[PDB]
Coordinates of C-alpha atoms and ligand atoms in Angstrom, one line a residue:
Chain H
X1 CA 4.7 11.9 -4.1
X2 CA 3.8 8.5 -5.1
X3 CA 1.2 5.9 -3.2
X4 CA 0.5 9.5 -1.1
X5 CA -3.2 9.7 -1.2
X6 CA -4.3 11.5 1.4
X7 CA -8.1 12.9 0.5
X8 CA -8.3 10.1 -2.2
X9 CA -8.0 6.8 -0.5
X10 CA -12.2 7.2 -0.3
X11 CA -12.4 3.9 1.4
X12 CA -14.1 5.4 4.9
X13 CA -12.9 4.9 8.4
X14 CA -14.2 3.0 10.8
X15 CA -13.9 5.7 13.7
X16 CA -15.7 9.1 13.3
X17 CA -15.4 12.4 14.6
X18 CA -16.9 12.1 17.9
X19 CA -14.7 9.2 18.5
X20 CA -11.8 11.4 17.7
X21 CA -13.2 14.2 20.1
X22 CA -13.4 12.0 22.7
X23 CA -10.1 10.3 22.0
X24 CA -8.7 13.8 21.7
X25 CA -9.8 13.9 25.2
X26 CA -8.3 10.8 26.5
X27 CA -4.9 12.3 25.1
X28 CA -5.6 15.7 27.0
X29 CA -5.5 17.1 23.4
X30 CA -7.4 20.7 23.3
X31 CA -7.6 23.7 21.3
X32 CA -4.6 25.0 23.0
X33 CA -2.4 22.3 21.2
X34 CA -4.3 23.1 17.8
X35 CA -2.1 25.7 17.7
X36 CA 1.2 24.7 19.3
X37 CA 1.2 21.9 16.6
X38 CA 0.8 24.6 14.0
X39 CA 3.9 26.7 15.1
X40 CA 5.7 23.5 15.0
X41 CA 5.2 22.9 11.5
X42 CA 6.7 26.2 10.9
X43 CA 9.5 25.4 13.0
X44 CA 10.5 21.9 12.2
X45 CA 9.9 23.0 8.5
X46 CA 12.9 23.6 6.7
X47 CA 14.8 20.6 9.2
X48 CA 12.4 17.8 7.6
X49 CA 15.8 16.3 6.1
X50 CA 18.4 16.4 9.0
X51 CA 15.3 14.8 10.7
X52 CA 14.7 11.8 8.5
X53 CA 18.4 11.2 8.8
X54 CA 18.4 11.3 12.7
X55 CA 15.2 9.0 12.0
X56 CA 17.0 6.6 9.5
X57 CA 19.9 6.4 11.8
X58 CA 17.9 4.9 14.3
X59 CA 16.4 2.7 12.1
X60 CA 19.1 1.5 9.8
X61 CA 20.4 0.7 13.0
X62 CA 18.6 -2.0 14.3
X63 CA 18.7 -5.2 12.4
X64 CA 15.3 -6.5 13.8
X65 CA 13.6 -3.0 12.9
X66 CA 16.0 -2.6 9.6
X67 CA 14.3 -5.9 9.7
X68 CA 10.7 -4.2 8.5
X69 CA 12.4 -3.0 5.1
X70 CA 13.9 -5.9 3.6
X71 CA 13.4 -8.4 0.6
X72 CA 13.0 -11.7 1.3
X73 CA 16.8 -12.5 0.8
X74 CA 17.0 -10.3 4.1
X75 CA 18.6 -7.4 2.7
X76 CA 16.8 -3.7 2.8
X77 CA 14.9 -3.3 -0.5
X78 CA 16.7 0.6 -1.1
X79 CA 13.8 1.6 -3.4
X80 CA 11.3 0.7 -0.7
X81 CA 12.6 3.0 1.5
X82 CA 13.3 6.0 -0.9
X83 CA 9.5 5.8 -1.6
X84 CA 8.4 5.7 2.6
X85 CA 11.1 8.0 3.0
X86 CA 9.0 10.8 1.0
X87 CA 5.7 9.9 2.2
X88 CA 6.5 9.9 6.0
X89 CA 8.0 13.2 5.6
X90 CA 4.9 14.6 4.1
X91 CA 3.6 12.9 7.1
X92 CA 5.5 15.2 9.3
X93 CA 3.8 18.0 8.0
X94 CA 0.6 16.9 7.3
X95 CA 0.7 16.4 11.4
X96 CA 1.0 20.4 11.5
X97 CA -0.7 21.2 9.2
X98 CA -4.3 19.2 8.1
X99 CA -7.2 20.3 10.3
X100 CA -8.5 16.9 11.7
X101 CA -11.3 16.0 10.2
X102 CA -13.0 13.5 8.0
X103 CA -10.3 13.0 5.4
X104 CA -7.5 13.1 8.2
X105 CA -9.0 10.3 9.3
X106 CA -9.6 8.1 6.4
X107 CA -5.6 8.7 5.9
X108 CA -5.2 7.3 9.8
X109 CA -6.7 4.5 8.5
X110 CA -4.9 4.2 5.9
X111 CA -1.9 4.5 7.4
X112 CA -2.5 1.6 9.9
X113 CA -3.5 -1.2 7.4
X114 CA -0.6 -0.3 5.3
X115 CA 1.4 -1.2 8.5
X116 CA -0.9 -3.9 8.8
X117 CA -0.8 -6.9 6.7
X118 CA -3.7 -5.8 5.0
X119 CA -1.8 -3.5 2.9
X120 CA 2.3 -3.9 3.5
X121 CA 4.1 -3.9 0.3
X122 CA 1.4 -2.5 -1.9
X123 CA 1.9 0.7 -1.9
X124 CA 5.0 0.5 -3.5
X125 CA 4.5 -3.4 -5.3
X126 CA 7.7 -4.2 -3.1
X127 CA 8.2 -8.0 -1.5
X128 CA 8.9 -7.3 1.9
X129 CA 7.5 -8.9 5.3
X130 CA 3.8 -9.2 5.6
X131 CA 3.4 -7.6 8.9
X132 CA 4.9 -5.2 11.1
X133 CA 4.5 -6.2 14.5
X134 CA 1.6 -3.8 16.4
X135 CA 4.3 -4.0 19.1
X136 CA 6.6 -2.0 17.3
X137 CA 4.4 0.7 16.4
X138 CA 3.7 1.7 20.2
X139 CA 7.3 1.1 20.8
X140 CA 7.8 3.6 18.1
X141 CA 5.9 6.7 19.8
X142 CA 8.7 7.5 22.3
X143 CA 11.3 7.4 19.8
X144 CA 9.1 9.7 17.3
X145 CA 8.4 12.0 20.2
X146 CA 11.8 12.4 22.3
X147 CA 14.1 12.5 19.3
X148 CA 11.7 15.4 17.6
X149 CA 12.2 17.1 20.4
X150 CA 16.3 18.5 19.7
X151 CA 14.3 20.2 16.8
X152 CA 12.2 21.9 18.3
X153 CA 14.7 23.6 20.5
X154 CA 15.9 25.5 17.3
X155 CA 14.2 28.0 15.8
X156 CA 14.6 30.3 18.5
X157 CA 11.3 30.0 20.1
X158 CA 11.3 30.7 24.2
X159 CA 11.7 27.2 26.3
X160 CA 8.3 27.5 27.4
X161 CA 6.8 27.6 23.9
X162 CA 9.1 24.8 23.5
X163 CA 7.9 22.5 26.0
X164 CA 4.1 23.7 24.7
X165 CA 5.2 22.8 20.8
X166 CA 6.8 19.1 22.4
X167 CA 3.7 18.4 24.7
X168 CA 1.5 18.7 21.6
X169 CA 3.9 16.3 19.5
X170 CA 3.7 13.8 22.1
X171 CA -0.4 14.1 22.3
X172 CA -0.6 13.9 18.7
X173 CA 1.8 10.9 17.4
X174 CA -0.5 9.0 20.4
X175 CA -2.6 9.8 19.0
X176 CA -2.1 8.6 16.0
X177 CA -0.5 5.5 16.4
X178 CA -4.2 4.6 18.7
X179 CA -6.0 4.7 15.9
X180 CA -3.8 3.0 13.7
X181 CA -4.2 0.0 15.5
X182 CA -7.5 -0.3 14.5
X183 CA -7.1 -3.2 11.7
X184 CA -4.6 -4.4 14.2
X185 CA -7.8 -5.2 17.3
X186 CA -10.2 -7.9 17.2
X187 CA -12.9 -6.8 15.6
X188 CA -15.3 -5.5 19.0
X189 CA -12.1 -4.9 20.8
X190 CA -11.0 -1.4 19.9
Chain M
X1 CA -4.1 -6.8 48.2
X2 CA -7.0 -8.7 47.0
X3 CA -6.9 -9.8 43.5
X4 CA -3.2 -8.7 43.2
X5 CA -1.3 -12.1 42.0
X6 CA 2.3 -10.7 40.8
X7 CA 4.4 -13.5 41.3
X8 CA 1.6 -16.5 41.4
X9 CA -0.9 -15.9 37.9
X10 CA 0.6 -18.9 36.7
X11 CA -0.5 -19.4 33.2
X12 CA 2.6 -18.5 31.4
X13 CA 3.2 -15.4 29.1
X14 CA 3.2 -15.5 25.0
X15 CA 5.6 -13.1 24.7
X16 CA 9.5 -13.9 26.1
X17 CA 12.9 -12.2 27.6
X18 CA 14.2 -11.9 23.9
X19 CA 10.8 -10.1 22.5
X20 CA 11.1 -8.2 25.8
X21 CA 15.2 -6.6 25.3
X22 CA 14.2 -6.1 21.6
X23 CA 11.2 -4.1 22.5
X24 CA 13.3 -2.3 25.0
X25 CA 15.6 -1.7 22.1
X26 CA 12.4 -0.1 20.2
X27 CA 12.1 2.2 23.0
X28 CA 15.0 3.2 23.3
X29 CA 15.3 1.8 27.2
X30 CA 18.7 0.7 28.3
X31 CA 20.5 0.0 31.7
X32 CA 20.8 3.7 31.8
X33 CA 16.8 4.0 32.5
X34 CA 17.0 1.1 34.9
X35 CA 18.5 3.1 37.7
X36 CA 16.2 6.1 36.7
X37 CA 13.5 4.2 37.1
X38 CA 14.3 2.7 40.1
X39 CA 15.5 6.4 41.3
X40 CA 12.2 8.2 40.7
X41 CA 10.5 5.2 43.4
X42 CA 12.2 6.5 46.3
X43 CA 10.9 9.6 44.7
X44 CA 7.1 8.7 44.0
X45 CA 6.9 6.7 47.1
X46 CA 5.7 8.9 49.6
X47 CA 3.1 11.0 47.6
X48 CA 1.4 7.6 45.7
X49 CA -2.0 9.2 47.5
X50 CA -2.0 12.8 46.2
X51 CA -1.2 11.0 42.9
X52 CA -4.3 9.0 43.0
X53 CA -5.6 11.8 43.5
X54 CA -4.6 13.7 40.8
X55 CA -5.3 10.6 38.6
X56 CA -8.7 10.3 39.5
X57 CA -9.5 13.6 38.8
X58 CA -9.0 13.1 35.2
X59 CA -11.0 9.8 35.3
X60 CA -14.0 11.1 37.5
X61 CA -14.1 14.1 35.6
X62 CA -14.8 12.3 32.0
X63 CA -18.1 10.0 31.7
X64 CA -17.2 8.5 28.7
X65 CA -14.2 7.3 30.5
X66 CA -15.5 7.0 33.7
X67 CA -17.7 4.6 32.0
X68 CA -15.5 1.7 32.3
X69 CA -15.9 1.8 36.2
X70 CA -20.0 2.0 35.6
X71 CA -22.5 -0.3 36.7
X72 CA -24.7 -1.3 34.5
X73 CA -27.4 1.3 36.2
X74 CA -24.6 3.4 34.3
X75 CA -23.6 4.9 38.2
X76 CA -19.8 4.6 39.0
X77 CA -19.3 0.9 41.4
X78 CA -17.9 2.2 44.0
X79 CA -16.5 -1.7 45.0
X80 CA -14.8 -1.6 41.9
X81 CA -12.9 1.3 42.3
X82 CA -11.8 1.3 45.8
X83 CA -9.8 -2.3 44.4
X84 CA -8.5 -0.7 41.5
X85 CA -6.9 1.8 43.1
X86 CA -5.1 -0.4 45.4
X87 CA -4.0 -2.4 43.2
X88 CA -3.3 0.4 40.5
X89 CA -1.2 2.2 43.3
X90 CA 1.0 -1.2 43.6
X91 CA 1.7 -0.5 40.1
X92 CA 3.4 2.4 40.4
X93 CA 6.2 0.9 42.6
X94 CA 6.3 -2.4 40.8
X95 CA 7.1 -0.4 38.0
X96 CA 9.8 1.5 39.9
X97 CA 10.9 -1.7 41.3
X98 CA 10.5 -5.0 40.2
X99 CA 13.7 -6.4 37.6
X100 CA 11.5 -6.8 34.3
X101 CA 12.2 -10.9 34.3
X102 CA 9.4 -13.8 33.6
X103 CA 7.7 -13.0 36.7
X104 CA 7.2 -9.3 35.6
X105 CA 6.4 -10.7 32.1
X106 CA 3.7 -12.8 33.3
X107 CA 1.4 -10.4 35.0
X108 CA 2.3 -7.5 31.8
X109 CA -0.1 -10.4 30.6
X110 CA -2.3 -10.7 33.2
X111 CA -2.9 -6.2 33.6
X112 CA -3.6 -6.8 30.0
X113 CA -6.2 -9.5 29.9
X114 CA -7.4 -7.3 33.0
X115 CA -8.3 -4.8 30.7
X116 CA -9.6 -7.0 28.3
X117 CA -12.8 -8.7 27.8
X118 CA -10.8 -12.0 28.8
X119 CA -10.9 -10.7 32.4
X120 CA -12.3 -7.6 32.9
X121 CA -14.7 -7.5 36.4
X122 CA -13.5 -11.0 37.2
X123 CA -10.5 -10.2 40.0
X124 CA -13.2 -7.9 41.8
X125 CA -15.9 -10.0 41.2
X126 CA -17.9 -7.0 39.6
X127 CA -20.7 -6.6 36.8
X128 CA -19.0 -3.6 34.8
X129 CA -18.7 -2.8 30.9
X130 CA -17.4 -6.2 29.3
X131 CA -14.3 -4.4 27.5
X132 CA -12.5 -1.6 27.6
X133 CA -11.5 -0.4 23.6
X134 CA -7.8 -0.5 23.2
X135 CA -8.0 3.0 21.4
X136 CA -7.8 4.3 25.2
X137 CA -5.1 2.3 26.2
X138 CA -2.7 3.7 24.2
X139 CA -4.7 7.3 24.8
X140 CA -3.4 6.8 28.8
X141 CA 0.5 6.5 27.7
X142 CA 0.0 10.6 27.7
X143 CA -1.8 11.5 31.2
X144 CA 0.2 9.0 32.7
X145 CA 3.2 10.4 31.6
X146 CA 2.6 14.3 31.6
X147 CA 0.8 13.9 35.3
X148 CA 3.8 11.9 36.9
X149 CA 6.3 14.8 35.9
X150 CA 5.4 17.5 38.7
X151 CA 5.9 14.5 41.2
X152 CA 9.1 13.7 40.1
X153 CA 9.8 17.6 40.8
X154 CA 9.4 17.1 44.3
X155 CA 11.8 15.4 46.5
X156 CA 14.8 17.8 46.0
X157 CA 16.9 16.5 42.9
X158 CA 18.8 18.0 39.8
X159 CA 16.4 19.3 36.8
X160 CA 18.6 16.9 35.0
X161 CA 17.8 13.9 37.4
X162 CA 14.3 14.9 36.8
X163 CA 14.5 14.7 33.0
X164 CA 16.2 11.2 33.4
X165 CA 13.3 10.1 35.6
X166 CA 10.7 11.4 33.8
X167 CA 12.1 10.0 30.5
X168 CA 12.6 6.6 31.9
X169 CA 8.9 6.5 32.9
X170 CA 7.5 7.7 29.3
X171 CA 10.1 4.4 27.9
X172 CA 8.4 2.0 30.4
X173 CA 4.6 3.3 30.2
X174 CA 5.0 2.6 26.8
X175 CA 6.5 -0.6 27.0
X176 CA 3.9 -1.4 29.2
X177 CA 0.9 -0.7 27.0
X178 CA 2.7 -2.1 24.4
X179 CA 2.5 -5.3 25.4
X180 CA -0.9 -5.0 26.8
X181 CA -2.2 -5.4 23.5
X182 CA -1.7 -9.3 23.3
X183 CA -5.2 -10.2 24.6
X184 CA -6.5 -7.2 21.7
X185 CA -4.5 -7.7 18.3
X186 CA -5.6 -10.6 15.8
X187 CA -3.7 -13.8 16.6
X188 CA -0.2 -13.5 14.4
X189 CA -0.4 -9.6 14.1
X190 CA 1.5 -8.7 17.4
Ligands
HEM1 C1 4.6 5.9 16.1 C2 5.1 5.0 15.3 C3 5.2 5.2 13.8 C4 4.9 6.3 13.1 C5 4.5 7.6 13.7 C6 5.1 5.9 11.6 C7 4.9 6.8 10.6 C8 4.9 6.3 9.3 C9 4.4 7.0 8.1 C10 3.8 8.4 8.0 C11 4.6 6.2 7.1 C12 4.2 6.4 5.6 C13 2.7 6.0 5.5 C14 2.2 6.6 4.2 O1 2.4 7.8 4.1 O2 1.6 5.9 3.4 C15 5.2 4.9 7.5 C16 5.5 3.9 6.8 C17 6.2 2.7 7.1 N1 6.8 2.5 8.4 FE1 6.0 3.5 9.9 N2 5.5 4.6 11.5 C18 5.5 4.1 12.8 C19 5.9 2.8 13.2 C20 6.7 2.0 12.4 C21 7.5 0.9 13.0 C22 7.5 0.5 14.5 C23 8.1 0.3 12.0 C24 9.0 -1.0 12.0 C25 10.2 -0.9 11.4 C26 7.7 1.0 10.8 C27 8.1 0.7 9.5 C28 7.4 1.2 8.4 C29 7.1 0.6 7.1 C30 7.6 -0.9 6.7 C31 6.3 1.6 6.3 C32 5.7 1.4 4.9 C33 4.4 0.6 5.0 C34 4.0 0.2 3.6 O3 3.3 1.0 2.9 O4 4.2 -1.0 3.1 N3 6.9 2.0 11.1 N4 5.3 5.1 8.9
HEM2 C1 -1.3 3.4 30.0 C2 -2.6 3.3 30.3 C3 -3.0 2.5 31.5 C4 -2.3 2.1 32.5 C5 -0.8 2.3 32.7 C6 -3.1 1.4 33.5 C7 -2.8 0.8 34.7 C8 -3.6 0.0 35.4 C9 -3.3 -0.9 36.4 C10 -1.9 -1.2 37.0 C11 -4.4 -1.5 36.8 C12 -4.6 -2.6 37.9 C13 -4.4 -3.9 37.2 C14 -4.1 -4.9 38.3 O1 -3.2 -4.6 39.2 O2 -4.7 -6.0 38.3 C15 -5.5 -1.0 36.0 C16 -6.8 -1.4 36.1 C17 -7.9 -0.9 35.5 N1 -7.9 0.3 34.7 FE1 -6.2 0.7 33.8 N2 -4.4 1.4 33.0 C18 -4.4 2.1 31.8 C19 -5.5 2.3 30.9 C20 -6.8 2.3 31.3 C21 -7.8 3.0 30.6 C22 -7.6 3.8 29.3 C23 -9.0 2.9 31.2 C24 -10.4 3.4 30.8 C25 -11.1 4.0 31.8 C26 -8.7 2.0 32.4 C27 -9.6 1.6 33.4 C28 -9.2 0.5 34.2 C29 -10.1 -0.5 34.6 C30 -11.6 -0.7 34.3 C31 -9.2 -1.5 35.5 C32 -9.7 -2.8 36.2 C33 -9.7 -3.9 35.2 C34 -10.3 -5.1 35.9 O3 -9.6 -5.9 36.6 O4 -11.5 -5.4 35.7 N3 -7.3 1.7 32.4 N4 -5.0 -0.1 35.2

């Protein structure tokens, strides 16, 4: 899966893993989520597909967030979003799946400056807008979290376990998307 | 409500009532929230207290976050809190009850500069901790979504009215923090 390096991008965070602990904390993320994220990998594995397209239908349906994908002559570049496409499915697994540690985070880095302007584009050597706006990404976390949520109502889990597998979602995509912002902050600021 | 200046802050908001329906749009928040919001006020209204109270439970109980209330002695300033919370408990029915216009807009700005280093312990006239890191501003969309949902439980309506309510206030808490991060991202990245 092309431009995907997780566990080779060996730059190295910013933010260790006592700030994640304690940021963990601020998100009322425990132990007991460790595991309700876990079951919903298994759950919202197979759907991965029927996802993205509930995604991209959100997405290709706003022309100021379309917006985010397009060559300069304002149309959507299609081969830059086959590429994300792949890599933030992966991503959707990943979530479930990697431990949290070290590497996880250097990717959560990663991540963020290649939302950033830092490295937009260069993942995929596409022309495309510099920047995506850091108010879109926290705009973003109640569309990824309510609209997962269908999903997870699927498998044939009991409501409750439900609920437990959403709550997690919504801790963890939070997150994510607060450490992301890091290349966003003035330096001192985050 | 000393410090509180809703209405009268008076230097004028960088972001404007386009930016504000397309971030709206991001969130997915319509006109169908606006009544919900407004809905889960007459709901909320009565128990703002035992919510405090729940609220400050979370913050008294962590030192890392109750930091950001410390003196520099490192012991919580009482002052500083008893203000907050007045002011904080505003919030909660603004929210429910102000139309988002400029006004609204322009003190978005100020809660964020608040937060800030720009004007952190300057409304209460405090010596504090100079900032508070964004990374825990986008941490609190979570507690102060999850925390408000028993409330909204309460005063007799339909599990479905509930959901609406609830959902409604994850759109505008994120909204919120969203565009708290003006004062924090690198001029041109927001
Ligand atoms: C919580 C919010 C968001 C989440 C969870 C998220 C998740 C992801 C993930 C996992 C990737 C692939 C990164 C990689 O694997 O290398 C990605 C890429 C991308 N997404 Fe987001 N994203 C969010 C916000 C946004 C927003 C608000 C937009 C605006 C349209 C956006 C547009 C893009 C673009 C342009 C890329 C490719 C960046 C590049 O490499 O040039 N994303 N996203
Ligand atoms: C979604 C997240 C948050 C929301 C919705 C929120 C809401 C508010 C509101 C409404 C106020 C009063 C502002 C005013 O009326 O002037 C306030 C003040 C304050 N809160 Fe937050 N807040 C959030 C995040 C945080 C975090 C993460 C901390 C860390 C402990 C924190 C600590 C404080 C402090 C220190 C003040 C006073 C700032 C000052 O004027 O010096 N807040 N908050």
């Amino acid at each position: 899966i092309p431009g995907y390096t997780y566990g080779e991008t060996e730059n190295r965070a910013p933010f260790n893993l006592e700030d994640l602990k304690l940021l963990k904390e601020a998100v009322m993320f425990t132990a007991e989520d460790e595991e309700y994220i876990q079951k919903a990998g298994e759950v919202l594995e197979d759907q991965v597909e029927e996802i993205l397209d509930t995604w991209w239908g959100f997405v290709g349906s706003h022309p100021h967030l379309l917006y985010y994908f397009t060559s300069p002559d304002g149309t959507p570049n299609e081969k830059y979003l086959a590429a994300v496409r792949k890599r933030f499915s992966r991503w959707i697994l990943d979530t479930s799946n990697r431990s949290y540690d070290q590497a996880w985070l250097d990717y959560q880095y990663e991540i963020g400056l290649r939302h950033h302007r830092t490295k937009k584009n260069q993942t995929d050597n596409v022309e495309s807008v510099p920047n995506i706006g850091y108010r879109y990404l926290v705009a973003f976390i109640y569309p990824i979290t309510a609209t997962m949520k269908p999903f997870l109502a699927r498998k044939g889990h009991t409501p409750e376990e439900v609920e437990k597998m959403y709550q997690a979602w919504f801790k963890a995509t939070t997150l994510q998307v607060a450490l992301w912002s890091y290349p966003y902050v003035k330096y001192g600021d985050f």
